């Protein structure tokens, strides 16, 4: 199974708690994280794009870097890990994304790909006057289909004459073309989103589910395999989890409970053994290094699951303990050096 790191482009990562680590997203922090992930043979690093935060005591996601420029900088200081940026497709013309992708292909020597998102949180767009209206909720994958057609023309041939409802290309040109086939990834959970992914993506990201129920996402990965059957394309599932690991199950549980006890309720308001809002009800693996290794090996056995995208409570120590204590016990990582 492949392992990626979801890099903290927003302050405080994925914990909405006064008891969680408090930190700003800097370049040098994301550089340290990605160089340590690459050292431990992580396969990829992805950044999201988040254009508005949730406030509260922790100013949660009020502070966020931009994904293409962050990943261009990270590409320059790495050599092997795959680098993915997220395009909020309402915010960038497709010929600009095409050229940014060819640029980071150049920086990285062919390690770059794009996560294409529709956007769904109206305020991120309404705040800058570019929300297309509430018809977007139902038509957004029609928009994304035209967007990706323009991208595939430009990457594949260097030109597009595409004409649709949303885009008009009149001999649009982007060269250079990427040195390797450009990877497109999607994070579609809906039927329309999975249908898009099945037609155009290399793989689809989905949410891990529950606390210490690693296989609870299986129905989502089954729906995505069904969507991929309809195109005949091999489009696997990469599943998002948070890992809270320690020397013992009891020690990891104590950390998780300490984070939940600090929940930043004002920030959680704006956003509105169970999952907790403290990490946006993310799929969570809480245990000893050995327990987390066993639970990740169970993820690897789910039909359609090809990888995991990981967040941690503390990225610098969480990547280190992952590489030193968890990954060496994982049957699904026995292929590493
Ligand atoms: C790993 C992951 C990363 C995501 N990143 C973003 C992002 O950066 N920006 C964004 O607007 N939406 C993001 N999303 C939301 C998805 O693109 C998508 O809208 C959501 O999964 C709901 O599916 P649907 O679009 O098919 O309803 C992400 C989802 C997942 C699972």
From Swiss-Prot:
Q: What is its EC number?
A: 1.14.99.46
Provide the catalytic activity annotation: uracil + FMNH2 + NADH + O2 = (Z)-3-ureidoacrylate + FMN + NAD(+) + H2O + H(+); thymine + FMNH2 + NADH + O2 = (Z)-2-methylureidoacrylate + FMN + NAD(+) + H2O + H(+)
What switches on expression, per the entry, is described as: Up-regulated by the nitrogen regulatory protein C (NtrC also called GlnG) and repressed by RutR.
Residues recorded as binding FMN, renumbered to this chain, are: 49-50, 115, 124, 140-141, 190
* GO molecular function list: alkanesulfonate monooxygenase activity; monooxygenase activity; uracil oxygenase activity
Which keywords belong to this entry?
A: Flavoprotein, FMN, Monooxygenase, NADP, Oxidoreductase
The record describes the protein's role as: The FMN-N(5)-oxide reacts spontaneously with NADH to produce FMN. Requires the flavin reductase RutF to regenerate FMN in vivo. RutF can be substituted by Fre in vitro.
- PANTHER family this protein is in? ALKANESULFONATE MONOOXYGENASE, ALKANESULFONATE MONOOXYGENASE-RELATED
Q: Which family does it belong to?
A: Belongs to the NtaA/SnaA/DszA monooxygenase family. RutA subfamily.
Write the protein's name: Pyrimidine monooxygenase RutA
Record organism: Escherichia coli (strain K12)
> What's the name of its gene?
rutA
């Amino acid at each position: 199974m492949k392992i990626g790191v979801f890099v903290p482009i927003g302050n405080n990562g994925w914990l909405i708690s006064t008891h969680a680590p408090q930190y700003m997203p800097t370049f040098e922090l994301n550089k340290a994280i990605v160089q340590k992930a690459e050292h431990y043979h992580f396969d990829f690093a992805l950044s999201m794009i988040k254009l508005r935060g949730f406030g509260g005591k922790t100013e949660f996601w009020d502070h966020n870097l931009e994904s293409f420029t962050l990943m261009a900088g990270l590409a320059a200081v790495t050599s092997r890990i795959q680098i993915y940026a997220t395009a909020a497709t309402l915010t960038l013309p497709p010929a600009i994304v095409a050229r940014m992708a060819a640029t980071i292909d150049s920086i990285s020597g062919g390690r770059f790909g794009v996560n294409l998102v529709t956007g769904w949180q109206k305020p991120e767009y309404e705040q800058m006057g570019i929300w297309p209206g509430d018809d977007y909720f139902s038509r957004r994958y029609d928009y994304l289909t035209e967007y990706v057609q323009v991208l595939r023309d430009l990457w594949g041939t260097g030109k597009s004459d595409f004409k649709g409802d949303f885009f008009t290309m009149n001999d649009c040109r982007v060269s250079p073309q990427p040195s390797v086939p450009m990877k497109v990834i999607c994070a579609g959970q809906s039927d329309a989103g999975m249908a898009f992914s099945a037609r155009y993506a290399d793989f689809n990201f989905c949410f891990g589910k529950g606390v210490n129920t690693p296989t609870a996402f299986a129905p989502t990965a089954a729906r995505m395999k069904q969507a991929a059957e309809q195109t005949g394309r091999d489009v696997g599932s990469y599943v998002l989890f948070m890992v809270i690991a320690d020397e013992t199950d009891d020690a990891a549980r104590a950390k998780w409970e300490h984070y939940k006890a600090g929940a930043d309720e004002e920030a959680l308001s704006w956003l509105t053994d169970p999952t907790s809002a403290v990490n946006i009800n993310m799929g969570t693996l809480v245990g000893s290094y050995a327990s987390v290794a066993r639970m990740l090996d169970e993820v690897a056995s789910v039909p359609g699951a090809e990888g995991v995208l990981l967040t941690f409570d503390d990225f610098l120590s969480g990547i280190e303990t992952f590489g030193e204590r968890i990954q060496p016990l994982m049957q699904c990582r026995a292929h590493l050096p």
